[PDB]
Amino acid sequence: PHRYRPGTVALREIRRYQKSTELLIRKLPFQRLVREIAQDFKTDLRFQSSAVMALQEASEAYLVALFEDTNLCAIHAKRVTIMPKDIQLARRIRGER
Amino acid sequence: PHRYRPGTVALREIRRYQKSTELLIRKLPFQRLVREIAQDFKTDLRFQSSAVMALQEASEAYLVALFEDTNLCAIHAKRVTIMPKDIQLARRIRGER
Amino acid sequence: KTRKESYAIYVYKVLKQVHPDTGISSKAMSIMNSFVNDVFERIAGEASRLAHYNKRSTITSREIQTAVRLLLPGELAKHAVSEGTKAVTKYTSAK
Amino acid sequence: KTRKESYAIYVYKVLKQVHPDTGISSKAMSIMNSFVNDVFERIAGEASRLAHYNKRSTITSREIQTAVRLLLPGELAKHAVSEGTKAVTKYTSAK
Amino acid sequence: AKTRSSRAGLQFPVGRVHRLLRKGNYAERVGAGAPVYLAAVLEYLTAEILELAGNAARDNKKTRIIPRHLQLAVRNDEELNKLLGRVTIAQGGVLPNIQSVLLPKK
Amino acid sequence: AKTRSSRAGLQFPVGRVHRLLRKGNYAERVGAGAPVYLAAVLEYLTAEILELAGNAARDNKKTRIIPRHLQLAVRNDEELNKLLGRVTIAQGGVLPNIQSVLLPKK
Amino acid sequence: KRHRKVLRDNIQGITKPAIRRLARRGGVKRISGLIYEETRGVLKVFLENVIRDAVTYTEHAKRKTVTAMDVVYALKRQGRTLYGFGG
Amino acid sequence: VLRDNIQGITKPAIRRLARRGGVKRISGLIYEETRGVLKVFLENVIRDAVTYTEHAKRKTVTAMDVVYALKRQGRTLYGFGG
DNA sequence: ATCAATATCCACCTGCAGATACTACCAAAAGTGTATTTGGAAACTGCTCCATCAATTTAAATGTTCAGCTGAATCAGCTGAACATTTAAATTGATGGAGCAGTTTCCAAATACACTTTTGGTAGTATCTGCAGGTGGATATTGAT
DNA sequence: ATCAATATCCACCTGCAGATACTACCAAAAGTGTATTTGGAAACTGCTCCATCAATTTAAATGTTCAGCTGATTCAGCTGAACATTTAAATTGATGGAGCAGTTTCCAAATACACTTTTGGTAGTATCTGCAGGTGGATATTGAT
Ligand SMILES: [Cl-]
Ligand SMILES: [Cl-]
Ligand SMILES: [Cl-]
Ligand SMILES: [Cl-]
Ligand SMILES: [Mn+2]
Ligand SMILES: [Mn+2]
Ligand SMILES: [Mn+2]
Ligand SMILES: [Mn+2]
Ligand SMILES: [Mn+2]
Ligand SMILES: [Mn+2]
Ligand SMILES: [Mn+2]
Ligand SMILES: [Mn+2]
Ligand SMILES: [Mn+2]
Ligand SMILES: [Mn+2]
Ligand SMILES: [Mn+2]
Ligand SMILES: [Mn+2]
Ligand SMILES: [Mn+2]
Ligand SMILES: [Mn+2]
Ligand SMILES: [Mn+2]
Ligand SMILES: [Mn+2]
Ligand SMILES: [Mn+2]
16 A cells, blocks of 8 residues: 655645635534633623634634744744644744733 | 853843843944934934933833843753844744744 | 923822822833823723724713723723722712 | 615726726625725824824824825835825816 | 716725714814825725736636635735734635745755 | 812812813713723722832832832733733833743752 | 523534644644644633623623624734624 | 944943843844844834924924834833823 | 656536626715814924033953853654544534514703803922942852862 | 852941922813703514524544654864953033924814715616536656665
């Protein structure tokens, strides 16, 4: 059988998703998360379905650009693997923590 | 002929400058820089004294805070010495680059 | 010659209540004056948006209150709201 | 029966000037409508503060012009200033 | 019976812009040239993005501009990228960009 | 002839706050209680900072609050630090803080 | 309604491959095992902050439905302006 | 003995700022890097301050011009009016 | 450099979700036209506070000597990638029911506006006083041996 | 360990830069009296948003194998820290004049209000088309050998 070497399929994935624009998290799970969190603030809320889509577009863009910053933090440490400490440096320099 | 180890006088300066609040660039050289830069936007400008001081408080606050982030970047790479690449990383994550 | 208005006297009044034997430098007072103006502007601007978002012509204490909750961190908001309400109740119940 | 205005029809005219054979999706148009509203509020916001700072009660094309220079980066500021000045000059003399 | 936009030579609505400047409570008074100047700026900015976005569509063999083309327009242009530096364009994706060290071999 | 500040039980000027809200173009109309409410909040936050700043003066063996004491007050407090996270206090300095990896090997 | 459902642990509905796809779009080649829980915690913080402000606009308007505009205004408040949803 | 105005921001002064920022050890290349960063910072803020001055038809940059410029740059400064 | 496995590119074709097209349309604005009110540009000016320059205190530059940090090199242990197969969730497109926004019309309560009196707040000016910085002496930290 | 070089600490002292306090206007509050303007209340009926279930589609989880990345370890060379000595620049305190800011003027321009006209939005079907998502098959790229 044929096998791609570790890193080859990952690079293929980067090209593919950097080329496309669809949301990468399934819709129903993200919607339950939004509902749960918001229920904890205020019971008996409804959501316009576009309110949830707006939250998902914002959330994914937030996370994509945080991973870019995290990636730069890993590479700064002479690694290719992102670690929680890369995310934490990124958020600290951003003034999020 | 007594002599302090590399780093002992550095640590002492840190404690010394973290305790005080005085501006750390001399006033005149800063004033000249400000005037030189303003001249490229509009010629023959005057400056209120407190305007130069405002610019200096701001610029010095900016650089101190950037030096903190830069230090966290050097430390992230397992170093104790700040390099231009640390400044550059700090600025890129801040969205200044 | 022109009058230059400032929160200085009221900041000083409040300082006397809180630390009767403590004074304050010129520069610190100027800092406190920027603080009050900045916070005024932030709260007023948010209250303004809220009114416009809701097609209302008036900034009422309710817009202020929601503005305080959007802008102030948790516990700060809680005590600010209760001070705000306290002062409004006191003021209305005044003959 | 509800009414809601947008800049859609004007965005489409401009599009027809620059790319006669190119359409635009409804989601793209929505982005363009947010874009215009966002830049309107930013310029008008800057123009507001600018007037306040100078004790003016009037927002004139001179405030709009300074707000454009504060807000827009270099080359876009230069060209937006011309187009604005040009449209004001023409508006005065056409009438 | 002339529109102020046609008088000013603009496609963007001068009357509308004047009214929005009134309703937004930006100042007590709004001068007559204010909404002409601002309408002109808004029109110029949308012409600038639509030109680049139409080109991006063409580079991708499409007659219809989608948000992806809008985002390629913005992020490939230094000045528009800075103007919209804190703005998220829904369904825009990102620019292709893989760091050097991540590529294989040496 | 009694001030609205005294009526509301405040040190901060409800009258001045009212004026500043009118002439600030925040909205067409301003309700009676808005300035009372806003004055109260402003007074409250002033008291909060002055308390802690006063305390920092005390610990440093001083009776006059300077900018340094304001900075110490604000930045040693999680909530004030957050509200003023993008503010610079002139002549404030910084908090003493040395990263532990920089400390000599005890 | 014959009842009402109880929401628990919905954050785990954000799977490891979904998080991996987001990292790929972000340009990430290799991912440590602990990233997935770290990211879940960052996303939860982000949503709490934005949902909190959106719900505040909703309540202020005396509504029981969170609108897209409530979310848009909340995102703008946080310097996360979003285009394509009504402002 | 010419030398540009930027070089008037000396190595020792930059060293001091780094110390307040908690820095122990400093590479030789930092000093030029820092001068470059300060120049960009000053350009960005001064341009805006001069823009307020010109708008007010003044020949003097006021502290308020600088304060306003800092604010709109997201660097609010307290202690200088406003 | 050679083969083959598996991915990728690009080509044409074709149903249709979504976009362009009227047609009525109507109405909510935008425009037009006097009639009233005023903001701020202008010009004149007085006097703060800004720039220039000639007095001392303070710092920067420079050379030299070496401690110890950074970067290179090497490698083993094991984490995280690739991928086949199994297992689970989401998606899609029904349908129905209630619960809530949303358009509409009433005036009672609220805030604007105007004008008249009566301060609290400010600038000026006149005292008071925290504490910066200097000195002395005791003892702590650091680093050599 | 001891021994000494230097940094750091505390107590006390004192004159003066920078506080507080006292005063005399008066701009702007507060009061007082009509003059609009508003945004629930109550009563609409009418969609979106929520729920459920079945059929179909897409993704997640798991098991297994091992490539290659991370982090540990070790070390030597170079570069930045420390510091003495040499050199330069900044700080300070002293004086004309630019120009900011204060005042008074008036007309060009902005508000107001009241008919008159038109362009923008949507609603109802009407018509149509760019392209997603399905097919080719020719053209790469990767990795085993
Ligand atoms: Cl980690
Ligand atoms: Cl470097
Ligand atoms: Cl109110
Ligand atoms: Cl104008
Ligand atoms: Mn819950
Ligand atoms: Mn039950
Ligand atoms: Mn006037
Ligand atoms: Mn190393
Ligand atoms: Mn493993
Ligand atoms: Mn009095
Ligand atoms: Mn002392
Ligand atoms: Mn001594
Ligand atoms: Mn002692
Ligand atoms: Mn004095
Ligand atoms: Mn060696
Ligand atoms: Mn070596
Ligand atoms: Mn060297
Ligand atoms: Mn003159
Ligand atoms: Mn029409
Ligand atoms: Mn296709
Ligand atoms: Mn095929």
